[PDB]
Amino acid sequence: PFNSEPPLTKLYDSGFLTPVSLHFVRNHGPVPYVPDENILDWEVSIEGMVETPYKIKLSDIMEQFDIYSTPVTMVCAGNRRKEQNMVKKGAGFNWGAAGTSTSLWTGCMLGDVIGKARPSKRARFVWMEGADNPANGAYGTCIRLSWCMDPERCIMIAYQQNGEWLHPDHGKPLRVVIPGVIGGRSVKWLKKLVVSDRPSENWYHYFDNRVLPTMVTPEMAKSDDRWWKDERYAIYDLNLQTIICKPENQQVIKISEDEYEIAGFGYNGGGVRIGRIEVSLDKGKSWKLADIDYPEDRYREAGYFRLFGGLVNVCDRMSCLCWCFWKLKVPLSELARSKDILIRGMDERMMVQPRTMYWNVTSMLNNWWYRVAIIREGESLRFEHPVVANKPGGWMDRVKAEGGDILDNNWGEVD
Amino acid sequence: PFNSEPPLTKLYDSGFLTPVSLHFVRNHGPVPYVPDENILDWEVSIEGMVETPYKIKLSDIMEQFDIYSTPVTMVCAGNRRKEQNMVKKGAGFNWGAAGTSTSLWTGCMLGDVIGKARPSKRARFVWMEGADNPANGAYGTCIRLSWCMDPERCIMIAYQQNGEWLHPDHGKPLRVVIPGVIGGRSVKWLKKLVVSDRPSENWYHYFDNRVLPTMVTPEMAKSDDRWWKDERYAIYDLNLQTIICKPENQQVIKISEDEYEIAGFGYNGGGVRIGRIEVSLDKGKSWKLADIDYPEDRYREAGYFRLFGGLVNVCDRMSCLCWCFWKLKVPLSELARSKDILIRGMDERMMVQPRTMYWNVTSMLNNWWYRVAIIREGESLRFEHPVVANKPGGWMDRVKAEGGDILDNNWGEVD
Ligand code: MTV
Ligand code: MTV
Ligand code: NA
Ligand code: NA
To answer: Which parts of the sequence bind Mo-molybdopterin (chains A, B)?
Structure first.
């Protein structure tokens, strides 16, 4: 496999729409390389439990279906994996907190494409299969049929990203983009859509992209395949995340009468808005309400307009399919009396991020509170994120050097 | 207002469908009393942003619309309020854990009723108003239009409960039943449906049924009305709850070689399945996987059939609109080495119940882990639930008698 993660500061600083060059990459195997001259002839087959199976070329999609341009936040299931790895080593690429990127995606509605084949009333799922050939054969997975037909979910088949034709690494020439759901279901190099009454039976649907129960050890999961065949553990909708980006790791700030603007981003699954983002400087004893900016709502408020030949119709939805940004000003004098900054979000289902880590075999969907340690050094404060992408230098490295237990009630820090 | 809560043991023991006589009751004011002879003439007006406003009598609903019979779990937003009251006294009826009841509801689809009036493309909400007249005028609130049109959500206008004509306390002759959403939105004695592009402006929509941010004090909420006018804090979909019912409060069990079957129920909002229910006997250090029974899935598997003149079509949905039951056998010898039983659920969005209480002004949607204390007395164990409905006798009463801080890292219990 191949994985690349943008620097957290660069991701935040780029703002609501991440440049294509910075978008994170996750490939299970070799990328199928498709030359520009072959793009328009790329063919997808629609089959299974449908009245009228058909095949369609990209050029035909572009001419025959309504075209949309939609901002969507993509998130890898493995985001924040390194934090879990610090607690107990496991398999998988050690993502920091920047395994997410947000783009305008241009293409057709998957529901329109499937609708044309007329799915059976007994159908429940749409299987998706890619043209790639990683170690265990073609990558494939699935999504609920009803979600494809739901305008609030805006599931797309995209052929442009921020108005550019897709790069090989991002699925050239065609991929599914599934908002509010882990990147694992957004199948790249799309070849086949199969309408079914049951989930995918693809190897990658079983043995990846699952949050196994916490008490299942890696040895149990290796020795008993049944752990990977219970749909209750398959990841679809994202869980709620909030990340601190300012102050930056190892940032040093002089203590003064000035306020400092703590800041970051949040995202969530299933189109459910994050209703509140709260910060604590006293280890969760009291919480302060951050100001949230939802840039997607600006697109919602603009009504209908076109970008890259596609209709922007955020205005037709109430869902939140993109990340939001948050800010909170605090006096430096208060930070100087604090040992850490914690952030947590609660959504419009009144579900909140947990205090407690949920360690699991694939170390996926790690959404316990993100913590930035505060170290006072003379008349200045220095700040430490939990982990750094690809290097030491976070508070978890320090706590391990101190002999501490990161899972204890004080994050392994002394008293 | 008037509130009544069934005994927790009786609620559990009754099983998947709660008898009408045991169903919890929540009225904000006097109940409008409607004689049997007046039922069929009861009229509802459909108005607002629609092409064709109309009025319809109950008898006409019964003859003109498709009739369904659907199991739905109802839950009061105030369930588990007494637990919060033990921490810091607040306003509101002190619910234990049994402010929930599950019934077969018979009636028409709200989406069919609204669909007939042809809502404007700009419409976003359906306001609902009741015939009652509590202190601040007619009770009214709202629900998203798109949710009314979604078959997975099965929002109904019901006139029978477990096959009986509705009782006055339960909305006779007609109410809305909104699955997966707090009982507050399931408007009783329904008189008016108004299609709008914005939320309800009813007094009860603002000043009740909200989870205000935790740092907002009762004094802040009393003095600044704006806290109650931000939709991000209005409750719709339920959050995830799991409750221990066995062992019962003050139950005493002889320590032996025998296993004991710990047991209870769970429920969740938005039709999202609870994928796992986990129990800890070691204060969250390790977790054990419970067995979950989902009786709704039996109705799903039965295909189409009729109950009380209504189509049962659970088979058409994938959503979970009802509670589930859970069981876990443990050796009594292991319980004897333990100081408590904790239970928590995680749903199919990989969102888990929190360790930390989220105290709030209305003390609503309290879903931190439910804890049963274990007290060893000679060769026996005695068990204590957090609180008892209407009386002392739980571990929270005991912890307060001990001078402890329930919000501390050990639930206020010694070391
Ligand atoms: N055909 C195909 N092969 C893949 O390996 C494959 N991996 C995916 C995963 S697994 Mo994760 O939930 O472990 S994030 C993620 C992404 C990321 O897309 P990007 O590289 O365009 O960011 O595409 C998904 N789609 C795929 N499609
Ligand atoms: N018209 C009307 N008046 C009410 O006071 C009223 N209260 C409700 C609340 S507020 Mo809560 O989220 O504070 S639970 C709940 C229920 C309960 O219905 P039941 O009495 O049939 O159990 O109906 C809701 N519907 C109502 N409808
Ligand atoms: Na909220
Ligand atoms: Na789950």
So the answer is: 76
Q: Ligand 2: distance of its center to the CA of B296 in Å?
A: 24
Cβ–Cβ of B352/A346 closer than 8 Å? no
Q: Please give the DSSP secondary-structure letter assigned to residue A10.
A: H
Atom of ligand 2 minimally distant from the CA of B26:
20
Residue A46: how many CB atoms within 10 A of its CB? Answer: 20
Please give the single-letter amino acid code of residue B55: K
Distance of CA A40 to the CA centre of its chain: 29
Contact B318 A146 (CB under 8 A): yes
Domains and CATH numbers, chain B: 1-236 (3.90.420.10), 237-415 (2.60.40.650)
Number of neighbours of residue B119 by Cβ within 10 angstroms: 24
Experimental method: X-ray
Centroid of ligand 1 to alpha carbon of A27 (angstroms): 5
For residue A71 the two structure tokens come to: 């901002």
Which chain A residues are closer than 8 Å to B242 by Cβ? none
Residues with Cβ within 8 Å of residue A267, at least 6 apart in sequence: A73, A75, A100, A238, A240, A241, A274, A322, A323, A324
Buried residues in B316-355 as b, exposed as e (16+ CB within 10 A) = ebebbbbbbbbebebebeebeebbbbbbbbbbbbbbbbbb
Task: Transcribe A44-60 into DSSP letters.
Answer: EEEEESBSS-EEEEHHH
What ligand 1 atom has the least distance to the C-alpha of A28?
A: 5
Beta carbons of B269 and A352 less than 8 Å apart: no
* C-alpha torsion angle, residues B162, B164, B169, B171 (rounded to 10): 90
Contact of A412 with chain B, judged by CB distance below 8 Å, is answered with: no
